[PDB]
Design a protein around this nucleic acid. Structure first.
Lengths: 44, 48, 46, 242, 211, 25, 48, 48
RNA sequence: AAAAAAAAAAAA
C-alpha cells in the first residue's frame, strides 16, 4: 500500500522553490522583502 | 477572544486530518469505542 | 414570602516584611514565593 | 537516525532532547546525570536509552529578556519589589526546567549575570558599588529578618569575616563566632537543590497512583470510605497531586 | 572534653551546605574533596552523605553519583561505604518506608556500577528470625533497583558465577529446604522468580519427607 | 447531595485518568 | 521553605544577621515577637 | 483526539517525557541493520 | 590559578 494515497491535497508545494530567480529591489520600504521578513520575524 | 483556544484547536484538528490523512488519523486516534492512549496503538500490526 | 434569587460563592480562596511601597503595591503581585497559589482548603473524607 | 548517525534530536516545549539508545553506544562508561533520561522498554522493562536534556537557546534568551523586563519595569527601583520579581522569575525558570536547567552551561552563566544585574540595580539605588559594602547577608537574608529575601541560582561564598557577633552580658562583652577554626566557608544554597527532578516525580507519580488505585479498590471492597489517614506517605506526591 | 561537639556539628553543617549549594553532581564531590579535614572523620562524612540522601523526598541521581565518585577514588573510601552498607542494613528498622527506599536506591546505584564490591551482600540473611518486614522491603527495593540498572540477563549472568557462591550463601541457600522454599516464595511474590533457577528442592533427597 | 457526589466522583476518575496516561493502555 | 532555613543557617545564624543590622540600637530585648508593618499610616494615607 | 495538545492530563515536561517514552517503545525503533531510518520533523504552521 | 556632578528633589 502506497502511504500517501489518502491525503486530501497533493503537490501543493510546487512552485515554492522558484524564489530567487533575480533579486528585485523595490523602492517602497513597506512593500520590500526586507520589511516583510522584519515584520514576520518580530511580530508573532 | 475567550473561546479562541477551542476554535483554533478544532481548526488545527482539521489541519491534522489534512497532514495525516483520514485513515492514518483514525489509526492513531483509535476507534471511538476504545480510544487509544497518547502515542500508543492497539497492536504492533496497526502501528507498522 | 418571596425567597428571591440565591447567589453563587467564588471558587474558594518575625512576622511581616519591609513593604514594597504604597504605589508599587499595584495589584499585590507578591503573596508568597515558596509555594504557588492560594491556600488550598482540604477535606478529610474524599 | 540512520545506520551511521546514532543520535535522535528534537526540541519540545522548552527542552532540547538528544535520545541515545543503549545499543549503539561507543561509550562503555555511562556519565548518567539527573538530566540524562533512562528510557524504559515496557515489553522488557529494561532501560534501553538515555535522553540527554538541555534548555534551548531561545529560552535562555527568554529568561534573559524576562530579567531585562523586570529591570525596566515601573517599580524596579524599590529593593523589595525588584527582589520579589527576581524571585518569581527564578522560581519559574528552575521549577519548569529542573534537571535540564542544571546541565546547561549557558543558562547558568545567564542566571549568574542576571542575578548580578539585579544586585547591581539594588546597589545603584544606594549610589555605591562597593563589594564590601553589600555582603551576601544584605541580599539573601529572608524578608522576616529585614533582608531582601533573594533566592540564588548562583554559587556565592559567605566569608568568615561576616560570621561574628558580640553580646554585652553583665560580666562584660563576649565575642561569639560560629565555625571555630574552620578554614572553609559556607555557601549560599542553590535553589535547584530544593526542587525534585522531573523524572523522579514521574516515577514517584506512577508508583503513588498505582498504590492509590490498589487502596481505592480494596477500600471499596470492604465498603469503607477513603480518608486522609490512609494517604499520608503519599500526600505531596504525584502528578497530579493526591 | 567537648560535650556540645562543636567540631562534629560544624563539620556536618559545612558538609551539608557544601552539598546543598552545588548543581552538578561532580561539583559537589570536587568541593567536598577540597574540605580540609583532621586526620580521620570519613565515617562522619559517609554517614552525613547517606543521611542527606535519606532526607530527600524522592531519590535523585545527584546522591548516587556523589557517592559513586567517593568510590572510584582510593580503596579506603570503598571499604568505608561497604561498612556503611553493613551498618545501615543492621540498622534498617529505625527508618521510614520512603527513607528506606532512598537508602536502597542509593546503594543500588553504588552496587550496579561496581562502585563497591559484590561481597557485602553476605550480610543479607534470608530467614524468618533475622529478617524483619522493613528488611524485606529494603531487599525488595534494592534488588528492584539492581534489576532496573543492570537487567534480567545481567542478574542471571553475574550471580550464576562459581566464585561468588560462598559470598551468596546467605541469599542462595542450599542447606535447609524450608529456607529454599521461603526464598523461592519470597522471590516469586516480588516478580523475580526467574533467578531462583539454582534453587532445586526436588533433589534434596536428604530432607525427603514426602514421597 | 447525590448529584454533587456524582460530579465529584467524575473529578476523581478525571484525576486518575490524568495520572494513568499510558499505564492504562 | 528548607531554602529559608538553610539560608538562615548559611549566613552564620540569626545573631550574625542581626549583628549586621541596627537590631541592638532598637533596644528590643529579644528578636522573637518582633513584626514588621508593611506600610505606614502616613504612607497608606497618601495612596490615591 | 490524543495528539491534540496542550492536554489537561500533563505538564509540558511530562509531554516531553511521554514523547521520549513513545519513541523508545516503538517496534524495533533502534534496529537499523536492514537500512531502516527514523525521521523526526519539528515544524510550525506558518500564518495559520 | 581569583572581575569599588547634573537631570532630581522650581520671578520688590
Amino acid at each position: 500500500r502506497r502511504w500517501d494515497e489518502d491525503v486530501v491535497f497533493k503537490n501543493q508545494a510546487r512552485g515554492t522553490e522558484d524564489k530567487g530567480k533575480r533579486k528585485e529591489f523595490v523602492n517602497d520600504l513597506l512593500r520590500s522583502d526586507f520589511h516583510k521578513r522584519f515584520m514576520s520575524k518580530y511580530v508573532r | 477572544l475567550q473561546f479562541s483556544a477551542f476554535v483554533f484547536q478544532y481548526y488545527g484538528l482539521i489541519l491534522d486530518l489534512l497532514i495525516l490523512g483520514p485513515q492514518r488519523a483514525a489509526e492513531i486516534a483509535g476507534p471511538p469505542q476504545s480510544p487509544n492512549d497518547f502515542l500508543q496503538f492497539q497492536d504492533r500490526d496497526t502501528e507498522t | 414570602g418571596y425567597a428571591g434569587e440565591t447567589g453563587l460563592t467564588p471558587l474558594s480562596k518575625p512576622r511581616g516584611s519591609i513593604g514594597v511601597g504604597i504605589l508599587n503595591d499595584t495589584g499585590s503581585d507578591d503573596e508568597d514565593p515558596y509555594e504557588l497559589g492560594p491556600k488550598i482548603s482540604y477535606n478529610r473524607v474524599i | 537516525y540512520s545506520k551511521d548517525n546514532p543520535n535522535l534530536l528534537f526540541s519540545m516545549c522548552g527542552f532540547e532532547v538528544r535520545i541515545l539508545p543503549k545499543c549503539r553506544n561507543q561509550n562503555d562508561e555511562f556519565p548518567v546525570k539527573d538530566s540524562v533520561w533512562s528510557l524504559v522498554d515496557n515489553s522488557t522493562k529494561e532501560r534501553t536509552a538515555h535522553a540527554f536534556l538541555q534548555v534551548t537557546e531561545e529560552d535562555i534568551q527568554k529568561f534573559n529578556n524576562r530579567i531585562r523586563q523586570i529591570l525596566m519595569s515601573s517599580g524596579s527601583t524599590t529593593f523589595t519589589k525588584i527582589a520579589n520579581k527576581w524571585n518569581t522569575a527564578l522560581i519559574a525558570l528552575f521549577t519548569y526546567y529542573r534537571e535540564a536547567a542544571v546541565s546547561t552551561v549557558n543558562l547558568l552563566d545567564t542566571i549568574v549575570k542576571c542575578e548580578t544585574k539585579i544586585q547591581t540595580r539594588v546597589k545603584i539605588g544606594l549610589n555605591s558599588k562597593m563589594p564590601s559594602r553589600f555582603p551576601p547577608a544584605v541580599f539573601y537574608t529572608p524578608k522576616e529578618l529585614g533582608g531582601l529575601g533573594m533566592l540564588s541560582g548562583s554559587h556565592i561564598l559567605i566569608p568568615a569575616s561576616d560570621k561574628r557577633w558580640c553580646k554585652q552580658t553583665d560580666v562584660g562583652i563576649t565575642h561569639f563566632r560560629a565555625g571555630m577554626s574552620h578554614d572553609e566557608e559556607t555557601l549560599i544554597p542553590n535553589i535547584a537543590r530544593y526542587i525534585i527532578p522531573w523524572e523522579a516525580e514521574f516515577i514517584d507519580s506512577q508508583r503513588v497512583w498505582t498504590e492509590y488505585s490498589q487502596k481505592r479498590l480494596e477500600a471499596q471492597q470492604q465498603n469503607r470510605r477513603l480518608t486522609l489517614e490512609d494517604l499520608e506517605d503519599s500526600w505531596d506526591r504525584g502528578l497530579p497531586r493526591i | 572534653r567537648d560535650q556540645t561537639n562543636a567540631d562534629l556539628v560544624n563539620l556536618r553543617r559545612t558538609i551539608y551546605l557544601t552539598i546543598q549549594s552545588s548543581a552538578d553532581p561532580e561539583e559537589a564531590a570536587h568541593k567536598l574533596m577540597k574540605l580540609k579535614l583532621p586526620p580521620g572523620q570519613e565515617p562522619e562524612l559517609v554517614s552525613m552523605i547517606i543521611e542527606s540522601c535519606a532526607q530527600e523526598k524522592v531519590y535523585s541521581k545527584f546522591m548516587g553519583l556523589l557517592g559513586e565518585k567517593f568510590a572510584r577514588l582510593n580503596r579506603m573510601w570503598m571499604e568505608l561505604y561497604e561498612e556503611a552498607f553493613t551498618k545501615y542494613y543492621n540498622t534498617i528498622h529505625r527508618y521510614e518506608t520512603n527513607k528506606l527506599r532512598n537508602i536502597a536506591r542509593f546503594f543500588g546505584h553504588l552496587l550496579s556500577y561496581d562502585a563497591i564490591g559484590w561481597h557485602v551482600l553476605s550480610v543479607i540473611q534470608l530467614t524468618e528470625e533475622e529478617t524483619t518486614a522493613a528488611s524485606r522491603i529494603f531487599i525488595r527495593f534494592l534488588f528492584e533497583d539492581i534489576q532496573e540498572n543492570l537487567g534480567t540477563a545481567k542478574l542471571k549472568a553475574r550471580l550464576g558465577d562459581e566464585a561468588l557462591q560462598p559470598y551468596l550463601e546467605g541469599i542462595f541457600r542450599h542447606d535447609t529446604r524450608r529456607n529454599v522454599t521461603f526464598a523461592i516464595n519470597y522471590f516469586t511474590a516480588i516478580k523475580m522468580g526467574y533467578l531462583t533457577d539454582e534453587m532445586h528442592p526436588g533433589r534434596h533427597h536428604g530432607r525427603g519427607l514426602g514421597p | 447531595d447525590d448529584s454533587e457526589a456524582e460530579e465529584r466522583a467524575a473529578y476523581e476518575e478525571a484525576q486518575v485518568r490524568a495520572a494513568m496516561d499510558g499505564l492504562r493502555g | 521553605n528548607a531554602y529559608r532555613t538553610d539560608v538562615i543557617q548559611a549566613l552564620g545564624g540569626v545573631e550574625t544577621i542581626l549583628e549586621h543590622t541596627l537590631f541592638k540600637a532598637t533596644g528590643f530585648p529579644s528578636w522573637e515577637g518582633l513584626f514588621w508593618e508593611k506600610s505606614s499610616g502616613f504612607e497608606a494615607s497618601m495612596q490615591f | 483526539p490524543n495528539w491534540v495538545k496542550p492536554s489537561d492530563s500533563e505538564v509540558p515536561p511530562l509531554l516531553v517525557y511521554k514523547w521520549c517514552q513513545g519513541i523508545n517503545n516503538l517496534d524495533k525503533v533502534w534496529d537499523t541493520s536492514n537500512g531502516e531510518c527514523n525521521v523526526i520533523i519539528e515544524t510550525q504552521l506558518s500564518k495559520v
